[PDB]
Structures are given as structure tokens and as C-alpha cells.
Design a protein around this ligand. Structure first.
Ligand SMILES: CCCCCCCCCO[C@@H]1O[C@H](CO)[C@@H](O)[C@H](O)[C@H]1O
Lengths: 214, 220, 215
């Protein structure tokens, strides 16, 4: 009765915290940027990607696009802020006109691209199609993000070292995916569960792979 | 059929008029191939890609696939002819057996691919799904086209030159996108509007850079 | 009556021709067998082929889609091969890392498949379930066409037919021609379109070989 509603609240809230560590992770890399006050070692795009991904999922969270999936709006809303901050700092601490011009442009594309689809979903669609369209787009967007953790695992093995795959980040993320998969499961929302379920698996292999290497 | 009915025609036509410049654009690049009679310098794939895009959108244009959206059929039908001509000139002038043959297989592939999907849809589907299916396929095709303008935008930034991004082409495409995005908006057609909307943003994005690099050029 | 048996014929033809495609990597594998090492080889396709065979297997089962039993049979056969091929690949390998990169991917495939296989039955009810799985399988199937196409490109560059056997392509082509036919009668887009897409490639494969055989 009252319990189920608190439980949905619990699963989402668990994720919103666990997500924070992941959001936090660029800062350690970012300090190295703050060092030498140059961006030479890394570009620099993923933040642009993460922001776009957060924006679309944020849209999904809003009550008109999907209802009772509001906790999801909060986490990406937090995340969109995180990615937005990283980029703004990235722009300031940039090496050359060329990086600065490139990142600014992509930010324009991301903001405009998101604006166009976010408007289009509400303008051109009436529920229940609007949810599945945003839900489909948001989900596809999320799975694409799995490319980076998959890549990091690939790096870890060949290198034979876990230096770049921190245990703290990997665990919090596994659990984050886990909370959300349950949350998706409770509303019987395919769009929340399936991508988050896939992330969990990736998180699971990451921990297991980590342990052997330790 | 009323007042708004004139407007849609206008937008479709306007888009239809702006589209040719994009269609014509390879010819200036193309003219060099013909002299010295070789393609060694240029491959050569995009014309094949553009054609496949034009057929699918063309098919969407047709009345059985979609109703009241023939202008789309016209613009792509026009484009497909340009692309087919571009391909054929490219075929004869292809340098080496491998270039000429590879294109033939791809060209064989494109027409076969299109015939199969165009048949499958009319055969396997009853409206409104057919419209939705083709529009979905048509739209996905159109966004892929966007890969090329994004890259040239990338080169301009690296080059710090507007040499490869002519203003005439940028404006024309921007207008084609605006016209077609507007056209889609009027009919409440997501399939036409959205990529064109996406294309408009790219077009706008291109105009902004040219203004910056042309203004910040050495000559000024 | 007459047609029902006809369904069995087209599916059977495909189920038989599949073994030839499934068998074809064995010849490259024998080379793996001598010296028990994979230095030349990184075998992503066996991991790729298994996952595709798995998903279509799901589409084949009666609760997922009904009367789609032959497709269930053929990939179920196929998945084991890929399952078998992966196993020989793991024990005989160059370094722990070649083995280890692959081990994880196999975990992903089984977990990935289980997750999607379960998710479908849990979150979806007919007629959507058939539509969802058929789509995932279909998209998966069309992706497989990438390898034969590249080989076509190779034939052109090489000016040689060494990298694609003539016997292999027709057997593949006949399966593609037969299975596309299997899909059409039940009016199943999901079976027909990709398989129809495959035969076309198959036709291209045969024609190129014929060209090179002549001159
Ligand atoms: C020789 C290079 C072989 C692939 C390189 C491995 C690391 C690349 C990250 O993986 C990516 O995962 C995504 C979904 O998980 C996919 O969008 C994408 O297709 C895939 O590339």
C-alpha cells in the first residue's frame, strides 16, 4: 500500500546519490587540466555527449513526457548541470582557438539539437506515443554511453592494470544501475529498466574483472 | 484544401528550389575529373549514398506511401537523377577495374536494396503503418547525410579557412532546410520536419562560422 | 494443407544450408588446431554470430512468436556452433589477455541475451512482443551482412576469389533465397526483409566470382 510508493522512492533516491560519484569522477581528471592550465592531454567531447544524454533523459523524467518517473528527471537535471560545468571550465582552460571553437560549436549543436527534439515530442505527439518516442530516444542515447565503460574494461585487460578503473567509481555505478533497474521494474517501465539493467551487467563484469586483477 | 493549402505548396516549392544548388554542387568538383579522365583523386562514395537517400524520401513522397506530400517526391526525384548521372559519369571514368567495379556492385546494391524495401512496404503494410515505416526509414537516412556537413564544419575550424565551405552552398541548404522544416511543420509531419530541422541547425551553424572566419580572415 | 507442408520445405532448406555456413570457419580453425595458437586471429565474429543466433532463437520460440518454429531450430543449431567455436578459441589462445578479452564479452552476450530475453516477456504482451523481438533480431541480422560485404570489397581489391569460396556463397545464397521465401508466406516482414536483403548480397557475391572466373 503505502509501502510500494516509498519503495519506488527508495530505488530512485538510491540512484540519485550513487550517480553523484560518477558525476564526481571527471574532477580528478579535471585537476590535472587545472594543472599546467592547459587541456592538451585530453579532448574533451564526452562531456558534450553526457550533457546531451542527460538532457534527453531529463526530458523523459518531466511529468508531461512521463509521469511518476520524476526521480529520473532530478538525476539527469543534476547531471546536466555537472556536464555543463565541466565544459564551461573546459572551454576556459582550452589549448588553441581550434579546440575552443570546436567545443563551442558542438555545445551549440547539443543545446539546439535537444531543444528541437524536446519541442518536437510535445508539439507533434500526444501520449502515449510521446513517452515511447522520448523513451526510445532516451534509451538509445543511454546505451551509446556504455561504449566508454566497455572501452575502459578493454583497456584494463590489455594493460593488465586497474589504475584507470577506480574501484570506488565502479562500485557506486554498479549499485546506481541496480537501484534504477529496480525502479524501472517497479513502474514496469521498459525504458528505465533495460538500459540501466545493461549498465548493471557492465558494472558487474567491471567489479569481477577488477577483483582478479585487484 | 483552403488558404493554408497555398502555403504548403510554397514551402515545398521553396525547399524544392533551394535543393538543386546542393544537387548541382558536386559538378564544380566533378568538372576536374573529366579532364585527365581519372577518379584516382576522388572517391566517390557520396553520390551513391545521396542517391539511396533520395529514393527512400522520394518513395515517402508518393501518394500511397504518404498523402499530400508530393513535393518531397519531386525534390528527391530530382536529386536522384542528379546522383544517378553523377554516378554514371563516375563509372566510365573510374580509374582501375577496382574503382569501376566496386561502384557497380554498390549501385547494383542500392537499387536492389531500394526495390526490396519499397516493395516490402506496400506489400506487407496497410496504412497508416506504411507511412510511419517509410517515414522512419526515410528520416534515418536523411540524418546520415548530415555527417558530411558536420565534417566540413570541422575542417574549417582546423583549416582556419572557408575554402571548402562556400557561402552560396551554405545559404541555399539553410534555406532548403528552413523551407522543408517549415513545410513539415505545417502538415504536422515529424518525418519531414525533424531532420530538416536538424539540417537547419547545421545550416545555421555553418553560416555562423563563415561569418567568423571570413571576418577574422587575414585579408580583412 | 498443401501450403503448410510448403512452409516446412522452405524452413528445412534453410536449416540444412545453415550448417554449411556454420561449418565454414572450421577450415580456418584447423589451422588454429595445429600449434594450438591464435596469433594471427582475433575472433570477434564467433561472439557476434552467437548473439544474433540467440536473439532469433528467442523470436523463434512459440510464446515469443507462434508458428516460427523453423527459425528457432536453425539458429539454435547455429548458436551451439558459435558456442562450440568460442570454447575451442578460449583454451587455445595467444596469452591470457586474448583469452580474457573474449571471456568477458561472452559473459556480456549471455547476460545481455538473458536480460533482453527476460525483459521481453516481462514488460511486453502480444502483439507487441513479436514486434519488439523481431525488430531486435532483424536489426541484428542486417548487421551480420557487414562481413560478407567487406569480403566483396576484398575480392575487388585483390582481384582474387581466394577469400570467398564459390561453394560457400551459393549455399549461403540458397539459404537466403529459401528463408526469404519462408518469411513471405506467413507474411512475416521480420524474416523476409533481412533475408531478402541477404540474397541480394548473395547474388552479388556469385556474380563477382563468375566475373573473375571468366577473366
Ligand atoms: C578495433 C576496435 C574494436 C572496437 C573497440 C572497442 C571499444 C569501443 C567501444 O565499444 C563500443 O560499444 C558501444 C555499445 O556498447 C557501441 O556503440 C560501439 O559499436 C562500440 O564500438
Amino acid at each position: 500500500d503505502s509501502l510500494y510508493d516509498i519503495s519506488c522512492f527508495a530505488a530512485g533516491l538510491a540512484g540519485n546519490i550513487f550517480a553523484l560519484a560518477l558525476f564526481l569522477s571527471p574532477v580528478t581528471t579535471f585537476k590535472r587540466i587545472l594543472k599546467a592550465k592547459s587541456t592538451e592531454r585530453f579532448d574533451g567531447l564526452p562531456y558534450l555527449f553526457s550533457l546531451l544524454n542527460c538532457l534527453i533523459c531529463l526530458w523523459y523524467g518531466l511529468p508531461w513526457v512521463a509521469d511518476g518517473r520524476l526521480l529520473v528527471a532530478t538525476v539527469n537535471g543534476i547531471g546536466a548541470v555537472f556536464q555543463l560545468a565541466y565544459i564551461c571550465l573546459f572551454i576556459f582552460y582550452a589549448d588553441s582557438r581550434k579546440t575552443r571553437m570546436k567545443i563551442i560549436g558542438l555545445l551549440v549543436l547539443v543545446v539546439c539539437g535537444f531543444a528541437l527534439v524536446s519541442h518536437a515530442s510535445v508539439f507533434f505527439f500526444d501520449q502515449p506515443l510521446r513517452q515511447q518516442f522520448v523513451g526510445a530516444v532516451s534509451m538509445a542515447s543511454l546505451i551509446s554511453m556504455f561504449a566508454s565503460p566497455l572501452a575502459v574494461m578493454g583497456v584494463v585487460i590489455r594493460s593488465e592494470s586497474v589504475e584507470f578503473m577506480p574501484f570506488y567509481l565502479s562500485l557506486s555505478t554498479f549499485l546506481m544501475s541496480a537501484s534504477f533497474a529496480l525502479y524501472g521494474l517497479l513502474l514496469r517501465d521498459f525504458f528505465i529498466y533495460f538500459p540501466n539493467g545493461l549498465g548493471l551487467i557492465l558494472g558487474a563484469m567491471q567489479l569481477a574483472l577488477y577483483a582478479y586483477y585487484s
